[PDB]
A = this chain, B = another copy of it.
Amino acid sequence: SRHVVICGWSESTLECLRELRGSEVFVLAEDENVRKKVLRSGANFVHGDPTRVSDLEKANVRGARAVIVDLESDSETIHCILGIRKIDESVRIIAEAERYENIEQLRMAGADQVISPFVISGRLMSRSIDDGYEAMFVQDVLAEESTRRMVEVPIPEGSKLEGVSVLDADIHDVTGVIIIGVGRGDELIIDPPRDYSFRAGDIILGIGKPEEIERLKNYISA
């Protein structure tokens, strides 16, 4: 579709730019001596300050589909989010929290989703004292190299599943995917109860092999 604008240069944005091959990516950063690694990773470099509205504007924030903000602190991140919300009130902002208490403030400023990596890292380091199966699970299903992949299938308009609960469906019995959550809008319910009635538009979050994913797509078809 459209392009993706990245404000700031970090390691998180480096791995995001690794995963974003094939799409058009702009990078808005202040450092001039990162242009070689930005152009080698496959993204156009736009010199500028991400907190300033003119430099935000030049990097085509208006026509973007998602803006990814990863600056040095949380004050600059909130300033960048408010500048982007001054330019376009409909674009998607994905921000990164450096501290734990600034998550609700980064949501108040206008970020559509706040990804706090040090909270995830601290909880995995706390749960990995006895045996580290949770960290292995997270770092394995997020990688697009394993046999099982976490993908979101949507329930199409006019399917066989409208009104049918998950207890009447038995998707794991007929397909073999593991239905770990069903999302609507911006709300996700992990491990939904048995009388949860399906709708048209609910996004099914599941884990399975791509053969099971294609079988699940063929099962919920129109």
A79: which B residues are within 8 A, CB to CB? 74-75, 78-79, 102, 105
Complex CA–CA separation, A121 to B141 (angstroms): 13
Question: Which residue of the partner chain, among B66, B113, B148, contacts A135 with CB atoms under 8 Å?
Answer: B113
Q: Are B10 and A118 in contact (CB under 8 A)?
A: yes
A109: which B residues are within 8 A, CB to CB? 78, 82, 109
With A75-B51, A172-B172 known as contacts, the answer to whether A115 contacts B135 (CB < 8 A) is yes
A18 at the interface (CB under 8 A from B): yes
Question: Which residue of the partner chain, among B10, B66, B133, contacts A188 with CB atoms under 8 Å?
Answer: B133
Q: Are A124 and B108 in contact (CB under 8 A)?
A: no
Instruction: Report the count of interface residues on A (CB-CB < 8 A).
Output: 94
With A15-B118, A79-B74 known as contacts, the answer to whether A191 contacts B205 (CB < 8 A) is no
Question: Which residue of the partner chain, among B118, B125, B143, contacts A123 with CB atoms under 8 Å?
Answer: B143
Query: How many copies make up the complex?
Result: 8
A120 at the interface (CB under 8 A from B): yes
With A105-B82, A137-B190, A181-B133 known as contacts, the answer to whether A125 contacts B96 (CB < 8 A) is yes
With A51-B75, A191-B148 known as contacts, the answer to whether A12 contacts B131 (CB < 8 A) is no
Question: Which residue of the partner chain, among B18, B20, B65, B191, contacts A207 with CB atoms under 8 Å?
Answer: B191
A51: which B residues are within 8 A, CB to CB? 74-75
With A78-B82, A183-B131 known as contacts, the answer to whether A188 contacts B137 (CB < 8 A) is yes
Which residues of A come within 8 Å of B, CB atoms?
Answer: 4, 10-20, 51-54, 65-66, 68, 70, 73-76, 78-79, 82-83, 85-86, 92, 94, 96, 98-102, 104-105, 108-109, 112-113, 115-143, 146, 148, 150, 152, 172, 176-181, 183, 188, 190-191, 194, 203, 205, 207-209
- The contact sample of 7 A-B pairs, CB cut-off 8 A, is A79-B102, A94-B132, A96-B121, A133-B152, A134-B152, A177-B191, A178-B191
